């Protein structure tokens with residue numbers, strides 16, 4: 017029984033493509049739905065699911081919206097393997113639902129910000145269906161030591177746009193750079209675009225939103 021709580025930007029024309037975008041820790045999908053609507057394509061649907069509220073270890077076990085538990089801020093810190101995989105399964109059900117209802121997998125893009133971006137990278141790289149690509153913003157690859165081995169054979173065709181703010185204090189830009197190297201270990205280095213933005217911190221920016229629009233226009237053309 018699939019029950020999805022989300023803010024969805026509908027296409028003005030019949031939808032022939034889907035973007036599933038995952039917000040960052042503590043948020044809802046509302047703000048990112050509004051942001052993606054400002055750059056929307058007429059035949060593209062943008063699904064922004066709301067993360068479930070769980071206790072987060074790093075925040076004194078406080079209950080808040082989170083895709084999985086968080087324990088440390090360094091690349092060697094323990095990660096919530098069971099939580100990351102369960103959340104990836106819930107996203108993979110959303111992918112299969114869109115597929116069951118007439119949207120080809122090579123017309124589905126996964127994406128997200130920070131924690132949500134991190135889940136979208138894990139899920140797309142391990143998805144058994146060949147997806148169009150990923151829009152990974154200010155994030156990292158969860159369970160990075162399992163890659164490239166852990167990636168599905170279907171990950172070869174992915175097109176990746178990875179963005180980062182150069183002055184990000186939450187997810188240092190070097191962690192984004194290390195993640196991009198790991199992504200080029202699965203996808204051809206030419207199909208991974210790593211864009212960094214000077215003077216940008218842990219946020220989006222109009223140049224990043226423009227890059228996302230340009231990437232999706234080329235990746236998801238009409239019909």
Ligand SMILES: COc1ccc(N2CCN(C(=O)c3cc4c(s3)-c3ccccc3S(=O)(=O)C4)CC2)cc1
Pocket residue numbers: 040041074086087088089090091092093095130131156157158160186187191192194195198
């Ligand atoms: C292949 O290269 C890499 C490079 C680095 C890593 N790391 C990144 C750090 N990390 C984390 O678990 C967290 C990241 C964030 C956490 S906790 C957080 C905590 C409190 C508030 C907000 C947040 S946050 O904004 O979501 C960012 C372990 C893995 C993996 C692979």
